[PDB]
């Protein structure tokens, strides 16, 4: 599924993402926008280390989900990476929350650092009723 902007903002708010571990909804929107263009079935294979990024948040298989084909990988979210390719984003949200419970927080995603950190992200939630 490719979410429209505001529908995703409300979906995320309903899932308890607004202010989760101090991360505003606008930051999560900026993250999903730059990681996948709000696309839940997005995938990116990293030929360099044999891992793959999954879903709307492009969560990596080396540490977060199990896809059975990533060397020496772990599964911190305790999910099959398949769960991160569903139209329903509940599991991807549970996993994204798990990611940010770690020291880096929202900084775990380099794209957030490149396109969201110290930027005016208000535009991502404007007019969505959130
Ligand atoms: Na894994």
Swiss-Prot record:
Disulfide bonds: 6-128, 30-116, 65-81, 77-95
GO molecular function, one term: lysozyme activity
Pfam families recorded: Lys
Cellular component per GO, a single term: extracellular space
C-type lysozyme domain residues: 1-130
GO biological process: antimicrobial humoral response; defense response to bacterium; defense response to Gram-negative bacterium; defense response to Gram-positive bacterium; inflammatory response; killing of cells of another organism
More details: Lysozyme C is capable of both hydrolysis and transglycosylation; it also shows a slight esterase activity. It acts rapidly on both peptide-substituted and unsubstituted peptidoglycan, and slowly on chitin oligosaccharides.
Family affiliation: Belongs to the glycosyl hydrolase 22 family.
Identification of the protein by name: Lysozyme C
Source organism: Homo sapiens
């Amino acid at each position: 599924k490719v979410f429209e902007r505001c529908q995703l903002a409300r979906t995320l708010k309903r899932l308890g993402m607004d202010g989760y571990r101090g991360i505003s909804l606008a930051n999560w929107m900026c993250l999903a926008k730059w990681e996948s263009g709000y696309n839940t079935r997005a995938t990116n294979y990293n030929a360099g280390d044999r891992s793959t990024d999954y879903g709307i948040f492009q969560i990596n298989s080396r540490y977060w989900c199990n896809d059975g084909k990533t060397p020496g990988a772990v599964n911190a979210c305790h999910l099959s990476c398949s769960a991160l390719l569903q139209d329903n984003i509940a599991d991807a949200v549970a996993c994204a929350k798990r990611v940010v419970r770690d020291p880096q927080g929202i900084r775990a995603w380099v794209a957030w650092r490149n396109r969201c950190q110290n930027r005016d992200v208000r535009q991502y939630v404007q007019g969505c009723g959130v």
